[PDB]
Amino acid sequence: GSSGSSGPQLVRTHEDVPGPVGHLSFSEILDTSLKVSWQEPGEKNGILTGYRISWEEYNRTNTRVTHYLPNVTLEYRVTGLTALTTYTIEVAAMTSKGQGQVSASTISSGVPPSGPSSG
């Protein structure tokens, strides 16, 4: 249904936009392609209008992208990364006011298969 998980332990103060999405999730990772998943934030603070995702190397914004998703999607496949490389995927939420906090989780590309089996 719609449950939470533990209490929010982060600066809240006065804020309209939403907070950090559920939790970053990475699957079907490869050498230059990985899937990103998350959940709905408990600080919806309104009716989510969408989610702003942004993937980028460990410390290389130059390799950052800006994508947009609806308030129905919470996962997206990333592509154009690097094999055996550290990356950071930031997933933010967008409301009728704007974008709020962002969940950035460090993830290092899986590994390049370089052909089937080995070849």
Side-chain angles (χ1 to χ4, degrees), residues 1 9 11 17 21 33 41 43 49 52 57 61 67 69-70 72 79 88 91 97-98 101 103 107 112 116-119:
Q9 204 141 60
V11 68
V17 277
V21 279
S33 25
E43 273 287 289
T49 40
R52 167 131 112 274
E57 264 222 59
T61 291
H67 266 328
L69 318 159
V72 309
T79 60
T88 261
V91 173
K97 123 77 221 161
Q101 228 135 321
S103 275
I107 174 75
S117 198
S118 51

Side-chain angles (χ1 to χ4, degrees), residues 21-91:
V21 279
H23 72 119
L24 262 273
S25 312
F26 303 146
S27 59
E28 289 272 54
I29 315 210
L30 310 153
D31 33 304
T32 69
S33 25
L34 72 66
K35 170 128 241 173
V36 169
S37 137
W38 57 88
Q39 254 263 350
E40 252 162 344
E43 273 287 289
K44 296 201 168 116
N45 269 297
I47 286 307
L48 304 177
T49 40
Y51 288 105
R52 167 131 112 274
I53 186 176
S54 342
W55 67 71
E56 76 174 84
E57 264 222 59
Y58 163 58
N59 57 358
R60 261 176 151 83
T61 291
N62 198 356
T63 67
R64 200 226 219 162
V65 72
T66 299
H67 266 328
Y68 279 120
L69 318 159
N71 59 327
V72 309
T73 283
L74 324 144
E75 74 236 80
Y76 181 100
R77 180 137 58 261
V78 179
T79 60
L81 324 155
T82 300
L84 304 199
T85 279
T86 303
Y87 274 90
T88 261
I89 323 309
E90 313 124 298
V91 173

